[PDB]
Protein backbone atom coordinates (compact mmCIF):
# COMPACT_ATOMS: atom_id res chain seq x y z
CA UNK A 1 0.00 0.00 0.00
CA UNK A 2 1.57 3.22 -1.26
CA UNK A 3 1.69 6.37 0.91
CA UNK A 4 -0.87 7.98 -1.42
CA UNK A 5 -4.03 6.37 -0.07
CA UNK A 6 -2.21 5.74 3.21
CA UNK A 7 -2.63 9.51 3.66
CA UNK A 8 -6.40 9.18 3.17
CA UNK A 9 -7.09 7.22 6.36
CA UNK A 10 -7.68 9.11 9.59
CA UNK A 11 -5.64 8.72 12.77
CA UNK A 12 -7.68 5.89 14.27
CA UNK A 13 -7.60 3.60 11.24
CA UNK A 14 -3.92 4.46 10.81
CA UNK A 15 -3.27 3.13 14.32
CA UNK A 16 -5.39 0.08 13.54
CA UNK A 17 -3.43 -0.59 10.35
CA UNK A 18 -0.16 -0.25 12.26
CA UNK A 19 -1.44 -2.77 14.82
CA UNK A 20 -2.56 -5.27 12.18
CA UNK A 21 0.72 -5.01 10.28
CA UNK A 22 2.58 -5.61 13.55
CA UNK A 23 0.62 -8.82 14.17
CA UNK A 24 1.27 -9.83 10.57
CA UNK A 25 5.01 -9.32 11.14
CA UNK A 26 4.83 -11.38 14.34
CA UNK A 27 3.17 -14.27 12.51
CA UNK A 28 5.67 -14.08 9.64
CA UNK A 29 8.59 -14.12 12.08
CA UNK A 30 7.24 -17.24 13.77
CA UNK A 31 6.64 -18.95 10.41
CA UNK A 32 10.20 -18.17 9.28
CA UNK A 33 11.56 -19.50 12.57
CA UNK A 34 9.64 -22.75 12.13
CA UNK A 35 10.62 -22.61 8.47
CA UNK A 36 7.47 -23.16 6.42
CA UNK A 37 6.74 -19.96 4.46
CA UNK A 38 8.50 -19.51 1.12
CA UNK A 39 8.05 -15.83 0.27
CA UNK A 40 10.93 -14.19 2.13
CA UNK A 41 9.97 -10.75 0.81
CA UNK A 42 6.86 -10.62 3.00
CA UNK A 43 8.92 -9.64 6.05
CA UNK A 44 10.57 -6.79 4.15
CA UNK A 45 7.25 -5.55 2.78
CA UNK A 46 5.51 -5.62 6.16
CA UNK A 47 8.42 -3.84 7.85
CA UNK A 48 8.26 -1.12 5.21
CA UNK A 49 4.49 -0.82 5.65
CA UNK A 50 5.05 -0.22 9.37
CA UNK A 51 7.68 2.39 8.53
CA UNK A 52 5.33 4.14 6.10
CA UNK A 53 2.48 4.30 8.61
CA UNK A 54 4.84 5.71 11.23
CA UNK A 55 6.07 8.31 8.75
CA UNK A 56 2.53 9.41 7.88
CA UNK A 57 1.55 9.65 11.55
CA UNK A 58 4.65 11.71 12.36
CA UNK A 59 4.03 13.99 9.37
CA UNK A 60 0.47 14.65 10.52
CA UNK A 61 1.56 15.27 14.11
CA UNK A 62 4.30 17.71 13.04
CA UNK A 63 2.17 19.25 10.29
Amino acid sequence: TTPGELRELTDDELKDKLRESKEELFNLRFQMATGQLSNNRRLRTVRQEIARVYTVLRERELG
Binding site: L18, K22, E23, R29, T34, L57, E61
Partner: protein
Protein backbone atom coordinates in the same frame (compact mmCIF):
# COMPACT_ATOMS: atom_id res chain seq x y z
CA UNK B 1 3.83 8.48 18.17
CA UNK B 2 4.94 5.15 19.62
CA UNK B 3 2.43 2.30 19.53
CA UNK B 4 3.69 -0.35 21.95
CA UNK B 5 2.46 -3.79 21.07
CA UNK B 6 3.28 -6.93 23.09
CA UNK B 7 4.60 -8.58 19.91
CA UNK B 8 7.99 -6.87 19.61
CA UNK B 9 9.12 -8.13 23.01
CA UNK B 10 8.74 -11.68 21.66
CA UNK B 11 10.95 -12.26 18.61
CA UNK B 12 10.92 -15.93 17.61
CA UNK B 13 10.37 -19.42 19.03
CA UNK B 14 13.21 -21.80 19.83
CA UNK B 15 13.21 -25.03 17.81
CA UNK B 16 15.33 -27.79 19.34
CA UNK B 17 15.04 -31.20 20.95
CA UNK B 18 15.11 -29.66 24.42
CA UNK B 19 12.46 -27.16 23.33
CA UNK B 20 10.21 -29.95 22.05
CA UNK B 21 10.69 -32.03 25.18
CA UNK B 22 9.60 -28.98 27.15
CA UNK B 23 6.65 -28.38 24.79
CA UNK B 24 5.24 -31.85 25.48
CA UNK B 25 5.34 -30.63 29.10
CA UNK B 26 3.46 -27.45 27.97
CA UNK B 27 6.57 -25.30 28.48
CA UNK B 28 7.49 -22.97 25.62
CA UNK B 29 10.77 -21.26 24.76
CA UNK B 30 11.00 -17.91 22.99
CA UNK B 31 13.75 -15.57 21.91
CA UNK B 32 12.83 -12.26 23.52
CA UNK B 33 14.19 -8.73 23.40
CA UNK B 34 17.39 -8.47 25.47
CA UNK B 35 16.04 -5.60 27.60
CA UNK B 36 12.77 -7.18 28.79
CA UNK B 37 12.02 -8.49 32.28
CA UNK B 38 10.14 -11.57 33.43
CA UNK B 39 6.89 -9.81 34.35
CA UNK B 40 6.86 -7.88 31.09
CA UNK B 41 7.27 -11.16 29.21
CA UNK B 42 4.47 -12.77 31.23
CA UNK B 43 2.13 -9.85 30.52
CA UNK B 44 3.00 -9.92 26.82
CA UNK B 45 2.45 -13.68 26.50
CA UNK B 46 -0.85 -13.43 28.37
CA UNK B 47 -2.02 -10.65 26.06
CA UNK B 48 -0.84 -12.36 22.87
CA UNK B 49 -2.07 -15.91 23.41
CA UNK B 50 -5.02 -15.19 25.76
CA UNK B 51 -3.74 -17.87 28.13
CA UNK B 52 -2.78 -18.05 31.82
CA UNK B 53 0.97 -18.08 32.48
CA UNK B 54 2.35 -19.83 35.55
CA UNK B 55 6.02 -18.83 35.49
CA UNK B 56 8.67 -17.32 33.24
CA UNK B 57 12.35 -18.32 33.32
CA UNK B 58 15.04 -16.36 31.50
CA UNK B 59 18.61 -17.11 30.45
CA UNK B 60 21.20 -14.94 28.71
CA UNK B 61 23.48 -16.64 26.19
CA UNK B 62 26.67 -15.22 24.70
CA UNK B 63 27.05 -15.53 20.96
CA UNK B 64 29.58 -17.96 19.57
CA UNK B 65 32.93 -16.64 18.37
CA UNK B 66 33.90 -17.94 14.94
CA UNK B 67 37.04 -17.84 12.82
CA UNK B 68 37.20 -16.41 9.31
CA UNK B 69 39.85 -15.67 6.72
CA UNK B 70 39.32 -12.03 7.72
CA UNK B 71 39.75 -12.91 11.39
CA UNK B 72 37.56 -13.64 14.41
CA UNK B 73 33.88 -12.76 14.42
CA UNK B 74 31.16 -13.02 17.04
CA UNK B 75 27.51 -13.93 16.65
CA UNK B 76 24.81 -11.94 18.39
CA UNK B 77 23.89 -12.75 21.97
CA UNK B 78 20.30 -13.68 22.73
CA UNK B 79 17.94 -13.84 25.69
CA UNK B 80 15.67 -16.86 26.03
CA UNK B 81 12.37 -17.01 27.90
CA UNK B 82 11.08 -20.39 29.07
CA UNK B 83 7.34 -20.00 29.64
CA UNK B 84 5.16 -22.45 31.55
CA UNK B 85 1.40 -22.27 31.04
CA UNK B 86 -1.34 -22.93 33.57
CA UNK B 87 -3.34 -26.14 33.90
CA UNK B 88 -5.99 -24.81 31.51
CA UNK B 89 -3.38 -25.52 28.87
CA UNK B 90 -4.60 -24.66 25.42
CA UNK B 91 -1.47 -25.40 23.36
CA UNK B 92 0.23 -22.63 21.40
CA UNK B 93 -0.24 -24.04 17.90
CA UNK B 94 1.61 -21.13 16.26
CA UNK B 95 4.76 -22.89 17.46
CA UNK B 96 4.18 -25.11 14.42
CA UNK B 97 5.29 -28.35 16.09
Amino acid sequence: ATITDPRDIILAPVISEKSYGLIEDNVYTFVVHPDSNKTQIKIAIEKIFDVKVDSVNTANRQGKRKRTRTGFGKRKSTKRAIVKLAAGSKPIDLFGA
